[PDB]
Amino acid sequence: NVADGFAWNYYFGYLKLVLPRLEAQIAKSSEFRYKITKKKLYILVPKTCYVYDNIADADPRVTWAGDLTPCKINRGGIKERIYKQAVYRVAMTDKHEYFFILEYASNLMSLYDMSLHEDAPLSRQERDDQVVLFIRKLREILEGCKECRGKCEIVPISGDEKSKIADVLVAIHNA
Amino acid sequence: NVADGFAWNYYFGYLKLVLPRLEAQIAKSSEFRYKITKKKLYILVPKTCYVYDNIADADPRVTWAGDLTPCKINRGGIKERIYKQAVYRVAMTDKHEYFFILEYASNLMSLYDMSLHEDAPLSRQERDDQVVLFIRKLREILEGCKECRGKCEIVPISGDEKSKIADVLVAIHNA
Ligand SMILES: Nc1nc2c(ncn2[C@@H]2O[C@@H]3COP(=O)(O)O[C@H]4[C@@H](O)[C@H](n5cnc6c(N)ncnc65)O[C@@H]4COP(=O)(O)O[C@H]3[C@H]2O)c(=O)[nH]1
């Protein structure tokens, strides 16, 4: 399944690079080192494959707050390729605010684009199926990785949970 | 074929973002705005799927010279994700000196790591087959894209051609 390649590539090409470094990148963040309590990356996976470039456009309670210190890695001929995470602020009631290291699995944007291309390499139904398999395979990879296990949460978001991202994140935080 | 996903993803997730911006990013570069004469990106594809992080380790004539002006693009929740190309100096026996925007198709590193993993979802022999299909599919995709067609070159490199990277680049430049 094409989902298998996307899951393995998100692991080897991103999570395996950034997750073993995650606590150190947080410790270097003067703004966020003490505002992020659980040192974990939250990865949104939309079942619809609808990735939002600004997560506040999906749920306005989830607003971009800042960058973590970027990783700089020599990779594929690029000296000091920049790997950058985002911190989002979540406020559900007026009583508590939360700061999450948060992003979409952005390679899924290519699955969306594939299903729209003129030659139709992927139907919309096939795309939905592959997102399900992507979640399953990525979780299986992470569960077997000693360097990455426990440092990230895969968060599937259904189409009718678009405006509920804040609720889901705060619930998981309070597990 | 898993190679189809890698080809579509390298196109939609990278080339379609950076190639329309490449001319402006070359023009903004203080070091290379005049040294890069043809405004295009050369993509190395190793048939072995073995990517060198320093291309000079394969062909000593091809040395890292600097960064191009990086693109900043909001992407999947990341504000101003950084997309950076690399410029390589190529020095031949004629004493002629060239500067190329050059990189590996870096998602192929994941395909290599897949073939080596304890739970390898593909064999080393299937990896070879998949790199061939990646080249073919990426060519077909780029074939049909007006904004990207003239702005990049796919450069397959076999194991016994590692030390001939400079020859191929300079030959294509003089096509
Ligand atoms: N939040 C975040 N995610 C990243 C970053 N870099 C990669 N990722 C994610 O891992 C996927 C695979 O990365 P790859 O490096 O192994 O292949 C990359 C790589 O081959 C190329 N590419 C993307 N950004 C690049 C860049 N800045 N430089 C060189 N190549 C780049 O496009 C491919 C797919 O990009 P993508 O955004 O769709 O998917 C990424 C992306 O979801 C990053 O810096 N920040």
Side-chain angles (χ1 to χ4, degrees), chain B residues 1 12 17 21 28 30 36 38 40 48 62-63 78 86-87 89 96 99-100 102 106-107 110 122 126 137 144 146 161:
Chain B
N1 296 289
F12 280 128
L17 303 175
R21 297 162 162 89
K28 292 167 180 173
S30 305
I36 300 167
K38 297 191 168 66
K40 50 186 174 169
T48 61
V62 183
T63 59
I78 308 303
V87 180
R89 187 184 86 94
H96 275 297
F99 292 86
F100 298 107
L102 183 65
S106 58
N107 57 340
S110 293
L122 79 165
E126 190 58 30
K137 177 65 65 172
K146 186 175 181 184
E161 297 157 4

Side-chain angles (χ1 to χ4, degrees), chain A residues 9-15 17-18 75 78 81-86 103-110, chain B residues 9-15 17-18 75-76 78 81-85 103-110:
Chain A
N9 176 229
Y10 196 70
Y11 171 68
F12 282 125
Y14 184 56
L15 295 181
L17 304 179
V18 305
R75 191 144 172 102
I78 314 301
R81 177 169 163 187
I82 302 303
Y83 292 80
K84 190 163 147 170
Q85 287 81 65
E103 69 184 69
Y104 282 96
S106 57
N107 58 336
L108 295 181
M109 302 180 73
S110 292
Chain B
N9 176 230
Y10 195 72
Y11 171 70
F12 280 128
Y14 185 57
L15 294 182
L17 303 175
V18 300
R75 190 85 172 157
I78 308 303
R81 178 169 160 189
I82 304 307
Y83 295 79
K84 191 164 68 169
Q85 287 77 66
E103 67 182 74
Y104 283 96
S106 58
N107 57 340
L108 294 179
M109 300 177 71
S110 293

Side-chain angles (χ1 to χ4, degrees), chain B residues 19-83:
Chain B
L19 293 183
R21 297 162 162 89
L22 190 63
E23 217 154 53
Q25 301 310 109
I26 299 168
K28 292 167 180 173
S29 168
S30 305
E31 299 302 328
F32 305 111
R33 56 181 59 161
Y34 310 128
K35 288 169 180 193
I36 300 167
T37 58
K38 297 191 168 66
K39 320 296 177 178
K40 50 186 174 169
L41 165 66
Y42 291 81
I43 307 147
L44 299 180
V45 183
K47 295 179 175 183
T48 61
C49 217
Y50 192 88
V51 169
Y52 287 95
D53 287 332
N54 191 351
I55 301 168
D57 284 327
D59 188 338
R61 296 170 294 178
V62 183
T63 59
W64 183 87
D67 295 315
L68 218 56
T69 317
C71 308
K72 307 186 300 179
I73 303 173
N74 297 338
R75 190 85 172 157
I78 308 303
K79 189 164 123 58
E80 291 175 1
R81 178 169 160 189
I82 304 307
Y83 295 79

